[PDB]
């Protein structure tokens, strides 16, 4: 619609992104599984996990796709899927002033090829993904805990990991050191059920 409340939408960028998505799909039919452009003009390419390195290399070196900047590499944990972890690569093409997202899937066991060869920035991002979610990255130069404690056990950002964790720290005089003890909260984190019983967005309705 119109008026200040509604956000203005640019259709030109939408058309450009759709065309380029088709371009990428045609060039890489072996790996590209699905191409989507969001209504807010964000092209997303879904690729089979085996194509992490080829697709990224194409999107980085190709003359008409000069995405030479790995903006952010992250993971989304959806426990309702067999391949719960979804590895998402956010790219930036300075030459064409555009961005693209490469989304792949992985299990808790299936390794994913490291993209350090494609982007050197991928090192620490993949370390974080392994540390927080537990997605092993094959051929990684140094895959180790980057954010958790040295002796920490478990992957915190997993949806099945408790928010407060399983262990807590304190200083004990008898052992003269900081010791790890089972977590005991003086005030339990009060879970608030806020989801309304009435549907909010008809456009995103999943038919039964």
């Amino acid at each position: 619609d119109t008026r200040p409340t509604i956000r203005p939408r640019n259709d030109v960028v939408h058309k450009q992104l759709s065309a380029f998505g088709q371009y990428v799909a045609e060039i890489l039919p072996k790996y590209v599984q699905q191409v989507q452009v969001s209504c807010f003009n964000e092209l997303e390419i879904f690729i089979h996990p085996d194509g992490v390195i080829p697709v990224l290399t194409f999107l980085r070196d190709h003359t008409n796709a000069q995405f030479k900047s790995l903006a952010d590499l992250t993971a989304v944990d959806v426990p309702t899927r067999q391949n719960r972890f979804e590895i998402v690569y956010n790219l930036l093409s300075l030459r064409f002033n555009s961005r693209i997202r490469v989304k792949t899937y992985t299990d808790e066991l299936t390794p994913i090829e490291s993209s350090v060869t494609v982007y050197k920035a991928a090192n620490w991002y993949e370390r974080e993904i392994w540390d927080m979610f537990g997605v092993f990255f094959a051929n990684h130069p140094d895959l180790r805990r980057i954010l958790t404690d040295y002796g920490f056990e478990g992957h915190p950002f997993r949806k099945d990991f408790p928010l407060s964790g399983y262990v807590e720290l304190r200083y004990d005089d008898e052992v003269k050191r900081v010791v790890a003890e089972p977590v005991e909260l003086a005030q339990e984190f009060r879970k608030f059920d806020l989801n309304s019983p009435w549907e909010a967005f008809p456009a995103y309705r999943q038919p039964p």
């Binding site: 404690d149 002796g151 004990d172 008898e174 050191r177 010791v179 790890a180």
Partner: peptide
């Protein structure tokens, strides 16, 4: 402490 954490003592 990290090494001693394996040996749950307290």
């Amino acid at each position: 402490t990290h090494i001693m954490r394996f040996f749950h003592e307290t």
